[PDB]
Design an enzyme around this catalytic site. Structure first.
Site: not given
Ligand SMILES: O=C(CP(=O)(O)O)Nc1cc(NC(=O)CP(=O)(O)O)cc(C(=O)O)c1
Ligand SMILES: Nc1ccn([C@@H]2O[C@H](COP(=O)(O)OP(=O)(O)OP(=O)(O)O)[C@@H](O)[C@H]2O)c(=O)n1
Ligand SMILES: Nc1ccn([C@@H]2O[C@H](COP(=O)(O)OP(=O)(O)OP(=O)(O)O)[C@@H](O)[C@H]2O)c(=O)n1
Ligand SMILES: O=C(CP(=O)(O)O)Nc1cc(NC(=O)CP(=O)(O)O)cc(C(=O)O)c1
Ligand SMILES: O=C(CP(=O)(O)O)Nc1cc(NC(=O)CP(=O)(O)O)cc(C(=O)O)c1
Ligand SMILES: O=C(CP(=O)(O)O)Nc1cc(NC(=O)CP(=O)(O)O)cc(C(=O)O)c1
Ligand SMILES: [Zn+2]
Ligand SMILES: [Zn+2]
Lengths: 310, 152, 310, 152, 310, 310
Positions: E54-55, E84, E105, E134
């Site tokens: 998603r990100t 490795k 990431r 993040h």
């Molecule tokens: O926003 C996403 C979408 P993704 O499932 O990472 O592709 N992930 C994300 C955001 C965040 N936190 C955020 O505030 C980002 P958002 O504003 O997109 O939710 C935390 C996590 C975590 O693994 O703890 C993961």
């Protein structure tokens, strides 16, 4: 009690020649006249932190041939005992509260010796620790040689294959280096040659050894031809192909083989010994696997049984 | 003899490790945990000499060493000598000859050896191969050159 | 026959105090005077749908110390028995046609009780069902406390660690809540504090308990210090680091420890108990693992043997 | 330090960490790798004193410290007193002032910090609290009580 | 020469109020008037050492919205380059010689920060490092909060769910705690409460906050209802069983919600927001996600451009 | 009509001296004056049948540096297309109908060569085939060697590490053995020595080489110190334990290094080069990696373009 009573079998170096002969002797007694209830009521731990089906099956069968009970484990994805990454010691520290002896195989060198400093009063027999030892294997190999040659002295012994890495090879060599008159022939690719540390040890004890690139070079003079498995990963494929011949037996290579020569192999054999070698009278790798039962029985008998009758 | 120039002044009966090669004096304090004690401990390094020129030198005020402790140092401090001094009078000069068993301060260069993760102390079987001292791991039973074990 | 004969051990709540004492007593009889053929000819099923090497090894050794036979399985990638995703019930429904008793470990709470409604006449002993019970563990813990304190009443018992999730903790607490005069001390991080449901139960039965953030706060007054493993996943790393100290023992923390204090731990210990604690006379976690053999023996003896002699 | 008879001497162009706690001395030689040189260094672990009794004492000659290197000492001897000295005279004597940061020497209690396995020298932000020092990692940015950071 | 030009983007703690604004301003400009060839010719590494679809796709899409190219990877079945072993430092010293900026990431805190120590002149944007920061989707939460409320001051913000572990709420809260007037509502069971290092920082800044148990006791004055996920796999099943129905939002719980009220969720929501809320006007989570494209765009356009024609 | 136009790029053995030069010349031109839209409209397959991040991203980045598009894949959890079974021939006859040139990496030698037999008119560039060739990063090593030495003749080249198995040294050596004056130094334990088929080819060309045990005995006359990795997973632990400290380079071993001396390493280095060498001026491994972008670019621009405006 007997010399080996409640002792530990960690190395083929912590054993003397009286010791060994003592094990083979007992192993012959039991083969001829078996005592199926000699360890009735004793419970043994077959701990295989490292997977080894053929050795585990063998040892456990030797365990049930004396009437002893068995418990244990195998290659657990996540180390067995403790169940979280606790130390080997905390592992042995506990099992030793449950059992009467421990047979273990571990992928790390020196695993049996460390357990030894924890099993309390519990005898621990090393079935294999990394690329270090594997005593019970050498015992059955010596028991198989001594039975079919009638002796363990002045023997023409040729060893073929991965002489560089095979632990059974280094070990048998050291054991036979406890007897006299032995002559060694070593046939392997220089990339997998017999370590200097061993040739250096044979040099000292005054033993005769020679290097050969072909089996037919000495087939003429050998009593026992002990083949190894050149773990196919030890080499680059094309490299392997070009040296392959150096270390493979077939029936036709046997033509000028002595009457008494037995062909041994710790197994698996599959890329070293053609199946046609099987039906020849020299082939003795299976009879060899068969004698691991009497060797392992002998080992357990002595160690867990005080005044071992015979 | 040297300490009577800019007077650090020697002391009575005891043990004073001296003739250690500089940069190998912090080691022994470390390795053999020497500063773990309370008896008047004084230390002096990067000092003067001749063929050595410099030298470290620990002084463990009143308290003796074993004949062997005199040895364990043998792998690190060869040409050096512990002073079995009995009150100012340097009487009893013990010169550490190579030990046959090293335990605890050595690390098995075998990354697969059982010793590493587990609660055991190292220990090797000393021998002078080609004279370059070959140490054997009590555990893996593998033998390396003292100059391979020492590195790290 | 004996009170527990052909009974089921599912919870430490379905057991009374006569029951427990009855188990410990028998467990002491067998320790002193063992009966290696008490279950000769009986066949027991060691079903570990969930993997647990130390408990399986223990239980099976208790199974062979009475001469009983054993069959079973472990953590099968795809549920064992049925071999396709058939129901637990259809599983027990069959094994019960083969065996004389069932020892099982399952990752789901209430697994032993459901099997119970299917084992026919077959006794099923719960070795662990999710985060619910684990009776045999508490028995050996009580057997280890009662042996070394001479009693199970008016005891100063301090419990350290993951008090919030540890099932053995909740269970020992409930069992000791069957005896009188017990005083509890609980040392754990408030994020892992002892559930209210328990403090509420102790409140009712009139038992004294107090909360402490440090071991040295009561080390002074404790008989038994029972440590838990704070499963490292239960927390965020940096969180773990900052609370780590709250729950770790070392030899020096022992200075003002009573003469009779034994340090127990269900294991694995590895991140809670420094190895230097080992050589102290208080350390008793291994002697503890050792007593699971007599506790499990006692349990099987009673349950599968009608007129248990002693 | 106070008291001088059968003791060590003095120097000309070097510093003198005086008034350092017991046992913490050696550690200061470890944590900061001071023996790591060629300058004539001398130590006094468990020395005679007036108020504190036995204070370790290091005198690394021909070596100078900043108002900050001294402040690195801050966590392991807030009492101590660095002595810049020349011509046998205490040119200047500084005291451990609490620093705003601490590099290289401290380790990150966050087992999940990328700092560890990686070839980076640690670093924390310092900030005194009521009863302790709060250390915040430059990497995982998690803060820890100095009691826990320095905790083994 | 743009403030964020060639500057790394690692922690919210490093971005001043005006920084946040330049990003949110530049954001809306880009959403009003897209500059598709803006980053034409620029190559960007989309390195996700910890897979996160998603990100990553939101990020990569943003990159393509400004004309740039992308090379990269996801998950690390391996070790994070080095066949490795290899340090994250080496794998960045290298990559940094190819691309114009790294988007990363990683499962370990500090990761991005170390990174910037080895990419020389190549800007490193953190898309999440372990449980630390993040910056990215928080600059988009904020963007969403301001786009719908018209402001980032004098707001009423409620936060529900895993507040102890949600690394996004900690950030958002620290982020909003840079503007004035805001009021916080924390609704989470005692087990997942908003940590005290967040509350201290608040009291220390004259910022009002308060704890509540039901959304209903604050639904009337809430401008932004920010729902976090519940790290379920983190709790006990029975515990989360409880602490659910209480902190789950339904369209009916919206009856008294303010006209301008918006519901946010970093996503994914499965238990927390019922599906019958999607259709109500407050549902803004997917619109918030879509807004990640504009926040992520501004950030790239700003970091890689000296002065933007906007 | 460019020499390498539409020609495949498979083995170093197939590229003549002038070929190498046209590539290294064209290379520097592109690094001086980039032609970003040069391969605009061209689609290129980045097929890594054997995952290899560093090479793939360096390769793909290069592709984007000339304006081309990329479709492709990494690792082959599967079988290499055919939903299991399908020959590499079919999966290339197909792909070749989509893209304008295939860049491939494969675990089997011959792979790329077979490939070219099925892509018809689509150029196939080998990014590594089993243990055979890696034309690609050797054209970049060379580029690096010439950029810093100003020449590829009359050089002093030392090579350390796994020389028996490093497929990159064999290539580099065969590559440099096409120019004149060069002198080789081979420093590797007897176990990993530079094979004799490499030494024969050398003697057969009047090219000087010599074996050494310490970098120190040649550090003064070395222009390029080319370090190979040690295929650790390939040796015995104790053996590699030894054969390490001897062939590990440290910044101090650089005390007498020539002013123009450069250190190279195909990467990754973990044991071989200490981190304190990175900062010295000889450290050129990451700069060499970066140079893979320019070698890989030239190669693509040459193969897909009739005549280049450079
Ligand atoms: O926003 C996403 C979408 P993704 O499932 O990472 O592709 N992930 C994300 C955001 C965040 N936190 C955020 O505030 C980002 P958002 O504003 O997109 O939710 C935390 C996590 C975590 O693994 O703890 C993961
Ligand atoms: N009470 C004492 C006596 C002697 N020493 C040290 O013992 C060392 C050796 O003394 P000794 O062998 O008796 O005479 P030297 O001249 O020092 O011998 P050498 O020439 O071998 O150094 C001297 O450096 C001296 O500092 C000491 O520290 N304390
Ligand atoms: N040539 C010198 C000069 C000074 N010092 C040391 O520098 C410090 C100076 O302290 P001092 O003048 O002796 O006064 P004290 O009574 O020791 O009290 P204080 O430590 O507070 O100065 C002492 O450690 C002293 O030994 C030294 O060792 N050699
Ligand atoms: O020898 C046995 C079983 P055994 O004692 O003959 O019943 N197992 C064993 C020996 C050996 N012995 C060797 O000498 C290696 P090889 O079998 O290739 O000759 C290797 C392995 C292995 O799994 O790597 C396993
Ligand atoms: O106690 C045992 C074996 P036993 O009955 O002591 O022989 N196993 C067990 C207990 C427990 N008991 C606990 O209280 C959890 P803890 O071991 O962290 O203290 C946990 C696990 C586990 O694998 O999670 C396993
Ligand atoms: O250069 C690389 C970087 P990668 O890890 O393949 O992405 N890999 C590579 C190069 C090479 N050899 C080279 O000479 C290419 P280089 O000049 O980039 O090192 C060999 C191998 C191998 O698997 O044996 C792998
Ligand atoms: Zn070892
Ligand atoms: Zn950190």
């Amino acid at each position: 009690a007997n010399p080996l009573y409640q002792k530990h079998i960690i190395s083929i170096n912590d054993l003397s020649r009286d010791d060994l002969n003592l094990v083979l002797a007992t192993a012959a007694k039991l083969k001829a006249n078996p005592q199926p209830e000699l360890l009735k009521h004793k419970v043994i731990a077959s701990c295989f932190f490292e997977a080894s089906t053929r050795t585990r099956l063998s040892f456990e069968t030797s365990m049930h041939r004396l009437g002893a009970s068995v418990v244990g484990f195998s290659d657990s994805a996540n180390t067995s005992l403790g169940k979280k990454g606790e130390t080997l010691a905390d592992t042995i520290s506990v099992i030793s509260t449950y059992v009467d002896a421990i047979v273990m195989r571990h992928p790390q060198e020196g695993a049996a010796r460390l357990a030894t400093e924890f099993s309390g009063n519990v005898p621990v027999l090393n079935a294999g620790d990394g690329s270090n030892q594997h005593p019970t294997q050498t015992l059955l190999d010596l028991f198989t040689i001594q039975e079919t040659q009638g002796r363990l002295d002045n023997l023409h012994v040729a060893m073929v294959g991965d002489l560089k890495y095979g632990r059974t090879v280094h070990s048998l060599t050291q054991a036979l280096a406890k007897f006299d008159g032995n002559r060694f022939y070593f046939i392997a690719p220089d990339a997998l040659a017999m370590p200097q540390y061993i040739l250096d040890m044979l040099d000292e004890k005054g033993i005769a050894w020679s290097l050969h690139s072909s089996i037919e070079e000495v087939m003429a003079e050998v009593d026992i031809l002990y083949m190894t498995r050149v773990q196919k990963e030890r080499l680059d494929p094309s490299e392997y192909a070009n040296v392959k011949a150096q270390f493979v037996l077939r029936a036709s290579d046997l033509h000028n083989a002595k009457a008494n020569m037995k062909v041994l192999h710790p197994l698996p054999r599959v890329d070293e010994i053609a199946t046609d070698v099987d039906k020849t009278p020299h082939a003795w790798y299976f009879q060899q696997a068969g004698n691991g039962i009497f060797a392992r029985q002998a080992l357990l008998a002595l160690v867990l049984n005080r005044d071992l009758v015979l | 003899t040297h300490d009577n120039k800019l007077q650090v002044e020697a002391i009575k009966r005891g043990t004073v490790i001296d003739h250690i090669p500089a940069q190998i004096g912090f080691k022994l304090l470390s390795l053999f945990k020497l500063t773990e004690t309370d008896q008047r401990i004084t230390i002096g390094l990067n000092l003067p000499s001749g063929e050595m020129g410099r030298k470290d030198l620990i002084k463990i005020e009143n308290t003796f060493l074993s004949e062997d402790q005199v040895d364990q140092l043998a792998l690190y401090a060869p040409q050096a000598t512990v002073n079995r001094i009995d009150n100012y009078e340097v009487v009893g000069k013990s010169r550490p000859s190579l030990p046959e068993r090293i335990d605890n301060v050595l690390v098995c260069p075998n990354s697969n050896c059982i010793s590493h993760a587990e609660p055991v102390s190292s220990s090797f079987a000393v021998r002078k191969r080609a004279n370059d001292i070959a140490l054997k791991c009590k555990y893996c039973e593998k033998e390396f050159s003292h100059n391979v074990v020492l590195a790290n």
